[PDB]
Design a protein around this ligand. Sequence first.
Ligand SMILES: NC(=O)C1=CN([C@@H]2O[C@H](COP(=O)(O)OP(=O)(O)OC[C@H]3O[C@@H](n4cnc5c(N)ncnc54)[C@H](O)[C@@H]3O)[C@@H](O)[C@H]2O)C=CC1
Ligand SMILES: NC(=O)C1=CN([C@@H]2O[C@H](COP(=O)(O)OP(=O)(O)OC[C@H]3O[C@@H](n4cnc5c(N)ncnc54)[C@H](O)[C@@H]3O)[C@@H](O)[C@H]2O)C=CC1
Lengths: 271, 271
Amino acid sequence: MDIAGTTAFITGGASGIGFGIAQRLLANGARLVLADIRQDHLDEARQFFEERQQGRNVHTIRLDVSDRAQMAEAARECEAVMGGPDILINNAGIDPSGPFKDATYQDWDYGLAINLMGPINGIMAFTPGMRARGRGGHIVNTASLAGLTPMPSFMAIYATAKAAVITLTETIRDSMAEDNIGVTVLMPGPIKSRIHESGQNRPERFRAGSGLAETEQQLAKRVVADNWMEPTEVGDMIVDAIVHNKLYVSTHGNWRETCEARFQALLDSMP
Amino acid sequence: MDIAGTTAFITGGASGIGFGIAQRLLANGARLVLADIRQDHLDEARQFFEERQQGRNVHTIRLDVSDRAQMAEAARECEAVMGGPDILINNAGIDPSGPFKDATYQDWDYGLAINLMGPINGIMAFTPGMRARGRGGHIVNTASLAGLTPMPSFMAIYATAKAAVITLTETIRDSMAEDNIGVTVLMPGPIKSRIHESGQNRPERFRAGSGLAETEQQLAKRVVADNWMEPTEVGDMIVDAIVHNKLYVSTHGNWRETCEARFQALLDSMP
Ligand SMILES: NC(=O)C1=CN([C@@H]2O[C@H](COP(=O)(O)OP(=O)(O)OC[C@H]3O[C@@H](n4cnc5c(N)ncnc54)[C@H](O)[C@@H]3O)[C@@H](O)[C@H]2O)C=CC1
Ligand SMILES: NC(=O)C1=CN([C@@H]2O[C@H](COP(=O)(O)OP(=O)(O)OC[C@H]3O[C@@H](n4cnc5c(N)ncnc54)[C@H](O)[C@@H]3O)[C@@H](O)[C@H]2O)C=CC1
């Protein structure tokens, strides 16, 4: 689908991959709504676009993607202020990793709430209007290559949710197609971002009784490696996927062999 | 690991696959705790084992796997009444399928609660004791080949949860191995069972506001095909998986080519 003249609603749009997607959709003629739980990220994103005299084409909404009431309100606000959206980017996510024995129910609930229920809530809150408006559209869900290649137990909560997002995206394709809405699942490798701030991003209700605060603290000190991919490169991959209705986008090839081995072991289990 | 003299806690143990697993574990020397939400299923299973002069080795507990308090109670009751368990079979599941545009948040919450949070609650409630007792053990999670081969939107909620269970099982392996607990994910094709009674099995709190009651009522009339596999055949596969610590068990090969095509499309997306 043509991006010019559309509105894109981008969760986690004010940092990292979502912000890279935002820049490149704007560059291709979309107007934007950036939805994010971090007011400071939103403010920074707004300033960045204002400096480039693009502030009129960008609206910001502070919300938690795991709060269904806020998501319903955001669908109304998006339509009223910016129109649409035609493009739905369910990209917000966090890193809930840590020693498996330390994780508590609060950590499971947090990890699944943001990384799996966020995209579901986006689909549920936004797609009825995308269908009704009858001008097609596109949905991008950000999963991870960690949802595909075998991962260790320290990453259980993350990998479990991200594998679900891949399958969610595959399964909804034919329903969305009824109304000329395409879908893409984005599976990144290492991208420069601020996901190391995940501890700050954890919603208040999941804080008490977490077993993983120490891990979040350590994570916050992790250096963004210079050889990780730039978010704008990912943004261009997403433009391409929307234009050409591509189901799968992977940013890196480094896990081809490990995925092949997993796939082989799965096939080998079949009579 | 070795099965004789162990205790196996089996969710959904009173019907279908779980009951097939129960029969074959008992045959191989295990004592059983069957946990199920259906009292009538539990009573029938009780009568079956009494008729075979094995009642003393089978205890039943009525519970909902998505109720964490009841699962904590079950871990206490299992240990106190029957010992252990040494073998944890997180097998309960339901069919939350239906026309995608009809599914509501209640349907998503239901399908994820039983088919994904059920196994997680089992792991969280039971594995601390399995580690503490220091005699190793095994965990079997029942996913589905629907979590691997591409599925249509009518099966979105089911597929999404089942894919997650596969990844969950893979990721916990190294943590469980620290305490000589092996893990297996079972991925069945069509097995003779009573899963068509899923509407009856939906917990009360997920009923109001469901969009799929009509689908559930049609499902209830579905005939169990004579050429579907017998649960005891699956049970024997699971005996072998526990004895030999096999990560993956698939019951059917009919989806080999459709999985291959999915896997190739995933690999093709990688640069
Ligand atoms: N190496 C990487 O950066 C990889 C990232 N991903 C995924 O990419 C997505 C984007 O993350 P990044 O750009 O890396 O990190 P990021 O932290 O720079 O950007 C994520 C944004 O989402 C926001 N956010 C977090 N939780 C939220 C919530 N509950 N509600 C609303 N907004 C929320 C954050 O405040 C942040 O601005 C995530 O889904 C992440 O899991 C996947 C693979 C690799
Ligand atoms: N029969 C088939 O063709 C396939 C079945 N499966 C899976 O096999 C597993 C077992 O299902 P089946 O043996 O086919 O059906 P079944 O309905 O005969 O057995 C499942 C049992 O789990 C119980 N149960 C349902 N919800 C529960 C809950 N919330 N708490 C406690 N118990 C609950 C049921 O009352 C029932 O006795 C499920 O996870 C299912 O998704 C996967 C692929 C194919």
